[PDB]
Amino acid sequence: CGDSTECSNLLLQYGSFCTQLNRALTGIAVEQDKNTQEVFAQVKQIYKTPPIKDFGGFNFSQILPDPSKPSKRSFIEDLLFNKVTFNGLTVLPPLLTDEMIAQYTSALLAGTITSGWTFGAGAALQIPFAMQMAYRFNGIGVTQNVLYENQKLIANQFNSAIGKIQDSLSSTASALGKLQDVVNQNAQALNTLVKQLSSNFGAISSVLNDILSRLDPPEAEVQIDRLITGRLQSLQTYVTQQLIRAAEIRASANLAATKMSECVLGQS
C-alpha cells in the first residue's frame, strides 16, 4: 500500500493473507537462530589456553587468537573476513555477535588441543598434546610406535602444510564460493523483489498517487485491485523461494553440526 488509506481498506477485505506471510518469515528467522545455536554451542564452559605453549613442536600461532587485535580473531579468520564481501523491508541483527562466535570457536579449539576428545563426554581432562597424537594413530591401524620416532618430521610437515594453506587462501581468491553464492542469491532475490514496484501489471501506472489523483474511486479501485493482485503474487513467490532456500540451508546446517560433533569432538 505504501502508506495509503483506501489501499489498506481494499486489502482488508482479502481475508488474512498476510498474517501467515509474516508468520513464515518469523519462523525462518527463529530457525536461523536455532541453526547457529545448535552448530556452535557444543560446549558447556569456556576454556582457555595457557600462556606458555610447548606442544611437542606443533605451531598453532596461525589459528590461536591473539590479544593484540581488537576482535581477538586469529590470522586465518582475518584472511577469510577480508576476502569475502528501505521500502518496508527490514533486516534484523543476529542474536549472537561475531565476538561471541569467535569465543565459542576459541574455546572449542583450546579444549581439543589441551583436553582431547574427553571434554565432549564429561569434564575436560588434560593430556599432553604429543601423547594425544599417539592415540589418533592407534585409531587408523598404525601403531603409536611410529609417531614417537618421527615427531620432528611430522611437526615440520604439519607446519609446512599450515603455511601452504595460509598462502593459498591469502593470494588465490574465489575459494570461498558457496558463501558468496548464498549472499549473491539473497541479494538478487531482494533486488528483483524491489524492482517489481515499477510494473503496470496491466494497469495504467505503477504509482498510486497519480492514479488516485486524476481519477475517481469507481475505477481507481479496479486499478488498485490489479496492482494489489500483482504485488501479492510477487510477494507470495518470494516467500516460497525463501522457504525452499531455508530448507536447503537447514540441511547444510545439520550436516555441519554432525561434522563438528563427529570429527572435532572425536576421531571418525
Partner: peptide
C-alpha cells in the same frame, strides 16, 4: 549482556594427565 558460560582454564602441562575414578 549475555554470558556464554563460566570461564575456566584447564591446568594444561606436558607431563600431567587426569584419569576418572
Amino acid at each position: 549482556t549475555m554470558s556464554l558460560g563460566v570461564e575456566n582454564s584447564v591446568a594444561y602441562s606436558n607431563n600431567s594427565i587426569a584419569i576418572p575414578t
